[PDB]
Write a protein that binds this DNA or RNA. Sequence first.
RNA 1: AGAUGGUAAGGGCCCACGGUGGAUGCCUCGGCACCCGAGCCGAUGAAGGACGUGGCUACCUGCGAUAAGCCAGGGGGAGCCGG
Length: 62
Amino acid sequence: MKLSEVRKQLEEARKLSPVELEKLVREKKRELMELRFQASIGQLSQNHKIRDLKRQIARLLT
RNA sequence: AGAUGGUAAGGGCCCACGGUGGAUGCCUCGGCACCCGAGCCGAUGAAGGACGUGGCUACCUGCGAUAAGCCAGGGGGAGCCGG
Ligand SMILES: [Mg+2]
Ligand SMILES: [Mg+2]
Ligand SMILES: [Mg+2]
Ligand SMILES: [Mg+2]
Ligand SMILES: [Mg+2]
Ligand SMILES: [Mg+2]
Ligand SMILES: [Mg+2]
Ligand SMILES: [Mg+2]
Ligand SMILES: [Mg+2]
Ligand SMILES: [Mg+2]
Ligand SMILES: [Mg+2]
Ligand SMILES: [Mg+2]
Ligand SMILES: [Mg+2]
Ligand SMILES: [Mg+2]
C-alpha cells in the first residue's frame, strides 16, 4: 500500500510542485547515499530501505 | 636294466563376479514438413550492440542513472520480491 498515501499527496505537492519536487528529490537522494554508506560499512543497514527509497524517487521523479 | 607319476615362471580355452566404456530400449524442453494466420521497422533515432543496473550478483534474463524497474486503464483473486 505504502505508495497511495505518498503518491497521492506527491501530486498534491502542487503547492510549489515542480520546485518542491526537485528539493524533495534531493533529500530523498541524500538519504539514499547515507543508506548505501551505512550498508557499505556493513551491519548498519537493513535492505528494503534502499529499494523503497529508490522506487520512491522514481515516481517522486514524475 | 625298464616303465610311467608330480612341478607352472608364465600361457591357453571355459565359468563366475567386477572395472572400464556408453551401445540398445524407453523418454523429450527441441527439431522437421505442410497448412492457416499474420506481414514491415527507422531522425519521435531502427536493426543490432557497448557499459551499466540487485543489500550480498559469476552468468543468464529483465531493465536503463527513475536502471529485475515508474505512472495509469483493463484482466485476475492468494499469494509475491526472475532463473
Ligand atoms: Mg507499485
Ligand atoms: Mg630301476
Ligand atoms: Mg605313477
Ligand atoms: Mg597354470
Ligand atoms: Mg607364481
Ligand atoms: Mg602364476
Ligand atoms: Mg562383486
Ligand atoms: Mg563384464
Ligand atoms: Mg559391467
Ligand atoms: Mg519445439
Ligand atoms: Mg518516419
Ligand atoms: Mg535495441
Ligand atoms: Mg545484464
Ligand atoms: Mg517491463
